[PDB]
Amino acid sequence: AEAESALEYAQQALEKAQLALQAARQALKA
Amino acid sequence: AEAESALEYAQQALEKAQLALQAARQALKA
Amino acid sequence: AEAESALEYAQQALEKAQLALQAARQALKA
Amino acid sequence: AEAESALEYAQQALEKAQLALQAARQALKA
Ligand SMILES: c12c3c4c5c1c1c6c7c2c2c8c3c3c9c4c4c%10c5c5c1c1c6c6c%11c7c2c2c7c8c3c3c8c9c4c4c9c%10c5c5c1c1c6c6c%11c2c2c7c3c3c8c4c4c9c5c1c1c6c2c3c41
Ligand SMILES: c12c3c4c5c1c1c6c7c2c2c8c3c3c9c4c4c%10c5c5c1c1c6c6c%11c7c2c2c7c8c3c3c8c9c4c4c9c%10c5c5c1c1c6c6c%11c2c2c7c3c3c8c4c4c9c5c1c1c6c2c3c41
């Protein structure tokens, strides 16, 4: 199930990217 | 500063997502 | 400005990646 | 091949996010 594990990992990485992006967007408002 | 750091981190996270995605795409070909 | 717009676009693109990833993960379960 | 198509789409979306992120990071240098 390397495929499944890879997609689960990619999803988690994307989640991390998203939350950092929101921090950056807030920083820019400021 | 925090914005720059957040974008740097997001880029690294996206790179990790991309490499996992490539593994997954190869897995499906098999 | 351009930075804000770029981050907005990146977030939308990440959202699209996430929803496709979820479809893919369901496809593999099947 | 909905799974394959989904991953190909997600990869393209991530590519778009990456290129916008690089624009944003350059904007911040400035
Ligand atoms: C977010 C978390 C994660 C993301 C969110 C982003 C911002 C903020 C939070 C949050 C905390 C989280 C997580 C964690 C990650 C993660 C990411 C994410 C980015 C974002 C930036 C900010 C922002 C602050 C926010 C705090 C907050 C802490 C939280 C922690 C961790 C942790 C860790 C990661 C990591 C990254 C990285 C990004 C960077 C941004 C900034 C700042 C900083 C804030 C801090 C710090 C905390 C701390 C660390 C690191 C670390 C650093 C770094 C970046 C820095 C930076 C800062 C701090 C670092 C560090
Ligand atoms: C990038 C392209 C794409 C990304 C790169 C980012 C920046 C720049 C280029 C580039 C051109 C690309 C693509 C295209 C996308 C895409 C994205 C990406 C982001 C980035 C930002 C900048 C930046 C400029 C740069 C030019 C450049 C043009 C190029 C085109 C398209 C096109 C289109 C998308 C779209 C997004 C969006 C982002 C946003 C950023 C900025 C600005 C703007 C620059 C322009 C403009 C051009 C134009 C459009 C749109 C559009 C807008 C918008 C964001 C804006 C914004 C600007 C322009 C918009 C528009």
Author numbering:
A (entry chain A), B (entry chain B), C (entry chain B), D (entry chain A): 1 to 30
Question: Any passages from the paper?
Answer:
In this work, we demonstrate the first ever high-resolution structure of co-assembly between a protein and buckminsterfullerene (C60), which suggests a simple structural mode for protein–fullerene co-organization. As in the protein-only structure, COP forms a canonical tetrameric anti-parallel coiled coil. Each tetramer presents four tyrosine residues (one per monomer) in exterior c positions of the coiled-coil heptad, and each of these engages a C60 moiety. One C60 is wedged between two Tyr residues donated by adjacent tetramers, such that two tetramers are needed to coordinate one C60.
